[PDB]
Amino acid sequence: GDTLCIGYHANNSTDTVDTVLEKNVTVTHSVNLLEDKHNGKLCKLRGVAPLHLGKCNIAGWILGNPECESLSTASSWSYIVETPSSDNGTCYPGDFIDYEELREQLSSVSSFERFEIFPKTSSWPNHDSNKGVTAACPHAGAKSFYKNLIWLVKKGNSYPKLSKSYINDKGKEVLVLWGIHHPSTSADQQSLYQNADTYVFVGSSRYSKKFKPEIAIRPKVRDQEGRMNYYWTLVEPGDKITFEATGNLVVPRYAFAMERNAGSGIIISDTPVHDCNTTCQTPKGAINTSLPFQNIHPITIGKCPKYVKSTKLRLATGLRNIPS
């Protein structure tokens, strides 16, 4: 007699899948829907170079911290890299008001050229600009300060009413930062700014606030008993920004021509940066997969898979592998 058995194939494969009826069953072939592998490098997202602040945070890069000179900003970036040990940010004590959403807006910028709305050489004739360097912001030993801001002093024995406006003429949202100094003592207040009471009004077509010092002795942070409170706004492509102050103003030396592109986030990791081509990027490591699910990290930026808690997500494309 002859034989025409109908059967399925088996192999030496030991891949295991789980069904509702039976778990830990071997299959001949399977595909992993759970990408558990990452290159471990913060590589390029979309097609442009992600920003790396190194030993800096957003409050230090944008302010112009002396420890942020190593980084380069030239073109669009898809996300911002910070080391978890990055503490070289705001080197003067204080709270950066509206901080986290400024971090969110500045996460991805299509057109960022760091230009100079007010040149230090000529834009402030009647005020002293060289004295605004602090021992709380060292660059190399000696006292330094933010490059992107000038912290003004009365020149001689008077602080005249500063009034200087920037008519935006670049077609992009000019991002502006300024500071308001809060001295520890009223003697410090007068000896820095001749006026005892000092309003700082900053106006725009859409944003208007008045700022006043809060003069009292704080506990020492970074060997400083006073705080230095920072503000920012987005100047629209055709409107104005009026800067008015009779004291306690840290003018923008450098503003930042900005054009937001769809928004992104900030990745905080120790991971080194290399040049790759990755659709998804996690702090642990960049992934290029079309696979629907991941388990590397919840915080992900890009066209990323969904983060799950599973460990065995395999579709059992092959049959039940029952060898012999």
Epitope: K131, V133, A135, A136, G141, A142, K143, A187, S191, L192
Partner: antibody
Framework: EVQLLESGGGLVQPGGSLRLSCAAS????????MTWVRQAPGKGLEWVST????????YSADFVKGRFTVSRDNSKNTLFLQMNSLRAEDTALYYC???????????????????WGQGTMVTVSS | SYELTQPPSVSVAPGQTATITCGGN??????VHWCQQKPGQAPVVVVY???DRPSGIPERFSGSNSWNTATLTITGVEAGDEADYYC???????????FGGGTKLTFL
């Protein structure tokens, strides 16, 4: 112009007292922190005590051991200093200096002594 | 606590760069107010900060604070540069003013 002035004492035995003053004129006196610095005749400068412009928080050196206390009078535009002479090593020319406005850190106190007063001899010895 | 040490004297040839040093602890994070004293005179400030010069004082007087030492780097010594050069700093930690012994430099 800013003209800091001096007044001191000639000679007092260890166990006596004498009065120093710095009658500043020519500027807004309330808002600059006055000092006192001395030097031995042929030795480097050494600081005695600063004062705050408000007349409150006072700072002084380590050689005083609590004896020397600078006091500030804003109303008459004149600074006062306590020489309660108890030791014979305090022979010097006594200068009062004005702290110019500082640069960010320690503005009222950590500033250059642009206007240096002259020196009144104060010698203590048996 | 905070200590300032300077050379007792610094030798220099006429017209050659004269360097005056006020060493100590990390004086970089600290404002140095250089001031010279001629015999029978009061301290006239020549560099009232890290690096900036007052008016009425010739340009050659310069200063550059560094990691541990301040340097009143005079670019060219002449007959009017023989004096004792003190360094004055306000110590933030202990709230003091500390001078130094100074350099009695001679242009020879």
């Amino acid at each position: 112009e800013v003209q800091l002035l001096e007044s001191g004492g000639g000679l007092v035995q260890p166990g006596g007292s004498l009065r120093l003053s710095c009658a500043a004129s020519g500027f807004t006196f309330t808002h600059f922190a006055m000092t006192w610095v001395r030097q031995a005749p042929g030795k480097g400068l050494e600081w005695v005590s600063t004062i705050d412009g408000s007349g409150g928080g006072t700072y002084s050196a380590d050689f005083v051991k609590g004896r020397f206390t600078v006091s500030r009078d804003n109303s008459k535009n004149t600074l006062f200093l306590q020489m309660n002479s108890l030791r014979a090593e305090d022979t010097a020319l006594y200068y009062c200096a004005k702290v110019s406005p500082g640069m960010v850190d320690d503005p009222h106190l950590g500033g250059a002594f642009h206007i240096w007063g002259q020196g009144t001899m104060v010698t203590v010895s048996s | 606590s905070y200590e300032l040490t300077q050379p007792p004297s610094v030798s220099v040839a006429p017209g050659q760069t004269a360097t005056i040093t006020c060493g100590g602890n990390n004086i970089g994070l600290k404002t140095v107010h250089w001031c010279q004293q001629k015999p029978g005179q009061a301290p006239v400030v020549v560099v009232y900060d890290n690096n900036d010069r007052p008016s009425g004082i010739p340009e050659r007087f310069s200063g550059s604070n560094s990691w541990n030492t301040a340097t009143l780097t005079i670019t060219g010594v002449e007959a009017g540069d023989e004096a004792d050069y003190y360094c004055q700093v306000w110590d933030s930690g202990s709230h003091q003013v500390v001078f130094g012994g100074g350099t009695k430099l001679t242009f020879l």
